[PDB]
Amino acid sequence: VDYSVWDHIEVSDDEDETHPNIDTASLFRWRHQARVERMEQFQKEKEELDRGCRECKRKVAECQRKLKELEVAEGGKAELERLQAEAQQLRKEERSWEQKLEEMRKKEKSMPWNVDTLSKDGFSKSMVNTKPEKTEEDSEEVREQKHKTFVEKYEKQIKHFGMLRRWDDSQKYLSDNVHLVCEETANYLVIWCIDLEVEEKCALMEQVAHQTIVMQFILELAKSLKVDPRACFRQFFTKIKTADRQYMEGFNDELEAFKERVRGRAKLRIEKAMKEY
Amino acid sequence: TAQGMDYLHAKSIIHRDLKSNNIFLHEDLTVKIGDFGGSILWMAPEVIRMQDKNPYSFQSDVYAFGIVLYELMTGQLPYSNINNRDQIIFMVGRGYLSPDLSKVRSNCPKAMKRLMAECLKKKRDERPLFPQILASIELLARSLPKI
Amino acid sequence: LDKIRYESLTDPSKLDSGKELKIDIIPNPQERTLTLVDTGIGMTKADLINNLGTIAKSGTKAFMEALQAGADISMIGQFGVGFYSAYLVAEKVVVITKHNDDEQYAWESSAGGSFTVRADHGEPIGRGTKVILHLKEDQTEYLEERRVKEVVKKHSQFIGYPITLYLEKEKEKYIDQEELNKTKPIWTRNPDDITQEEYGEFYKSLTNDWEDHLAVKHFSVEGQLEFRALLFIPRRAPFDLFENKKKKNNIKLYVRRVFIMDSCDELIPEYLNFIRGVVDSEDLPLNISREMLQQSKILKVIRKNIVKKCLELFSELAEDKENYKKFYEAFSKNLKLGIHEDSTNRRRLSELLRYHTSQSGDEMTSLSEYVSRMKETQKSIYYITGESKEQVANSAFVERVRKRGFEVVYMTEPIDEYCVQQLKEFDGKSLVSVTKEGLELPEDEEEKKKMEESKAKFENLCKLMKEILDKKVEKVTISNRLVSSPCCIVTSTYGWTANMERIMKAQALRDNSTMGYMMAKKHLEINPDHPIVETLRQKAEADKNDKAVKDLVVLLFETALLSSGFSLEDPQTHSNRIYRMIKLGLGIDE
Ligand SMILES: Nc1ncnc2c1ncn2[C@@H]1O[C@H](COP(=O)(O)OP(=O)(O)OP(=O)(O)O)[C@@H](O)[C@H]1O
């Protein structure tokens, strides 16, 4: 294990380190412009030394050719001595450029890192997803075809669950439902509860009142809200799960309002009972 | 403002300008240093020096801070009667002037007067380094509330 | 599992003891046991004794180094002390092991100073290993199903292997729930092979939804630090986007497909909160506690890249004018906030704004496209800020700059002031509003002389009117914004403006000492065209001063105060003045 490589990462634009008496934006500007002018200065220096090295190498090739052609020839002892002195001097400044080259090469590892050095792009790809239309809805036919399957696939499950009102089970089952259920069989199940009220099932009747009041509230809130009810349950769940004594008593008085509505629906029920039967 | 600029320069940071418009007086009395557009034409002839293309140094910043704070205490502009940029720069070439001494406040504090007088004697290169200036500021401040 | 999988792709005939791969969980609240059988590679007695019985060493590193130098696998685990964290909540563990070429063995310890191994006979295991535990008495809470499901969802659900559950609920069945992980990762394989629909599918399984997204970006980057992105954009603006409080978990972060941490006060700026995604990578300087990343500068480098390569998508999507309508109506708050607080990328963001102008009845107009059609002599764009669309649609100031065929825009929203306050330029131009210290527009020469004649002829009425009005207004002049109304009110450059005068009062948590200083001084503007102002002149040179002039001037001034959206402090004073004449309307007061 060695983290000595991940220890000199710096940015031109840090936020946590700042001063109470300094402008943050102008400080970003100063840091970035300093960092870029510094890279460009070191750049200029590095192509300067690179072209110095290139001309040094071309002169090395030239002097190698000169030495070869002097070896081919003979009798130029003075010229040979002069070019030997020149070659020794060239070798001396060659160690000069070499020691500074190795110094800068070594200090390259000491240079702090940055984003444009660590990263090189390899891929990218976008998309839009503007698929044609969502739906167009009639008023007559769809009310049956999806309705029947919504009835059989959920009436028994809602009968099974509706026997309880404990909060987290109710919340998660209703989350499943609003992920999957619709409205027609919801209302129609409510009216089955209404016409089954005869058995006087007190806990069942309270939970029936709860489910019908929440579905009615969700539907009116969604309609005035112009949003799909199936995606409108979270704020209700967080409001009713932390419903305190005042909020529960508001629920109780609105339930009393629903209770005179219960008396009204029962009266119309009994009247239709005599009329039909 | 001295504490702020000391902190900024503590990271080897140059400013290249601190023109008196670059200050925002925020809530209460708090300085925010600006960059975008008293000593806007009063810098040292170091600017006019165009040799080796790097005359920039901390000395110009120190002198500019000194003159700017002195004028800000003073409250009015030096050199507003005679204005000839070409003739001013020619006179800078030879026959450069000296600051006027009559233009001084009556209640100039002794420590600050001594510091500003001592700043520039022969060369604008042996200026002191920031935190002892800060110490002089703090001692003069916490040495004359009333007692 | 991965070890044996890679080993298999050398000689597939060696797997003649079991032909599949699976992971299983066995709770048992009778002897209080937590059997955790898997089907990994196995272990031999010698490696067991000389490797497991020693603190702080990984055999994985030695095995990986033994495997050539450079291969094709990305494995996890390099520290070694991971099994010794199993005693945090435990009292006694036993490991049951067997290798294909070894015998059955069991290892036992109880956090003491010694351990035991022993050969055993019983149920035959093919190649897997068992870990069995005795749970503490005080922590008998992790055994039920809901906590286990919650924790497995939270931490590790992306391993592409079948972890399964065998609980027992109500003739009674053996629950074989396999769906613990059934949403394989999508940023791994070749990006081209994916067929659209799972981009719609994966987003739903990401956060519990039944809608679809609006865009996607899937870039990946190599080099030294390597990672991949799976950013999305939601179709519907959440009601609770600003509810905060609950810890923010919009953007996650994985290292080798294992959850580490999540936070978006360093990964992305606050005004881009609505974006989700996966930022998986390969290797980072992690902690011994495998949740924190030391050397926190990395979490600052990643931010630059993420914002840079999201802004490109944002700029690109400005082509289709249909989708841009539904996007701009929903998340405009984010861009309008972001333009306020950012410095590196401001000019680039100065074109994604759409406004309503006075040439487009019910269509938004781009300001960049606005740069096309202006007149030649004109300088700088003209704009107004109001409280309501219709309220500003027909304003008294406009009635002069509208007759000349120019073009203006309406920024009528509280944040619009915040945006327009900071930005002051667009492509060499300036942004100036109508109510800033008497703007003037270049125009024909002959109007100059008559206007200055009104200046030089109406000096006395302008002189004597300031006496009767005490120190409320600064100056009254004749300018060019009035053709159908006598009077109006305009602010000053160094000071506040009318609409933010109400954004500040309406702001809840603020001091009450700030009003003293930066209230903007006020300016009144008169129109020497309405006959009322001329009718004032005859009584001005006729009567030096009396009650009637005071009454009329205070009435007109107080009415003018309402004209610019200012709210009076004593409505009874003006209500009495309006009721004073309706009684003359029917005649006899008394
Ligand atoms: N299920 C297992 N089957 C066989 N050998 C195992 C098993 N788990 C651990 N070992 C062995 O015992 C060692 C204990 O190390 P452990 O796996 O707990 O840590 P690690 O993977 O190196 O680190 P970390 O848990 O931080 O990723 C392993 O390196 C491996 O040699």
Residue numbers in the entry:
A (entry chain C): 2 to 278
B (entry chain K): 560 to 596, 615 to 724
C (entry chain B): 51 to 220, 273 to 692
From the paper:
Activation of client protein kinases by the HSP90 molecular chaperone system is affected by phosphorylation at multiple sites on HSP90, the kinase-specific co-chaperone CDC37, and the kinase client itself. Removal of regulatory phosphorylation from client kinases and their release from the HSP90-CDC37 system depends on the Ser/Thr phosphatase PP5, which associates with HSP90 via its N-terminal TPR domain. Recruitment of kinases to the HSP90 system is mediated by CDC373, which functions as an adaptor able to interact independently with HSP90 and protein kinases and facilitate their association. We have determined the cryoEM structure of an HSP90–CDC37–BRAFV600E complex, and structures of HSP90–CDC37–BRAFV600E with PP5 bound in phosphatase-engaged and phosphatase-autoinhibited conformations.
The two structures are distinguished by whether the C-terminal phosphatase domain of PP5 is packed against the N-terminal TPR domain in a ‘closed’ conformation or is substantially separated from it in an ‘open’ conformation. In the PP5-open conformation, the two domains of PP5 are completely separated, with the C-terminus of the TPR domain at Arg150 more than 50 Å away from the N-terminus of the globular phosphatase domain at Tyr176. As with the closed complex, the cryoEM map suggests the presence of the HSP90 C-terminal MEEVD peptide bound into the concave face of the TPR, and the terminal helix of the TPR domain makes the equivalent interaction with the hydrophobic pocket formed by the C-terminal domains of the HSP90 dimer. However, the phosphatase domain of PP5 is no longer packed against its own TPR domain but is instead engaged with the ordered kinase C-lobe of BRAFV600E. The detached phosphatase domain binds down towards the middle of the complex, bridging between surface loops at 461–467 in the middle domain of one HSP90 monomer and 569–574 in the C-terminal domain of the other monomer. In this position, the substrate-binding cleft of the phosphatase domain docked into the cryoEM volume, would be in direct contact with the HSP90-bound C-lobe of the BRAFV600E close to several inter-helix loops, and the point at which the unstructured C-terminus of BRAFV600E would extend from the globular C-lobe. Although the resolution of the map in this region does not allow full modelling beyond the globular C-lobe, the early part of this BRAFV600E segment downstream of residue 721, including pSer729, would be well positioned to interact productively with the phosphatase active site, although much higher resolution will be required to confirm this. Based on the relative position of the C-lobe and PP5-phosphatase, pSer729 is most likely to be the residue bound at the active site of the catalytically inactivated PP5 in the structure of the complex with HSP90–CDC37–BRAFV600E.
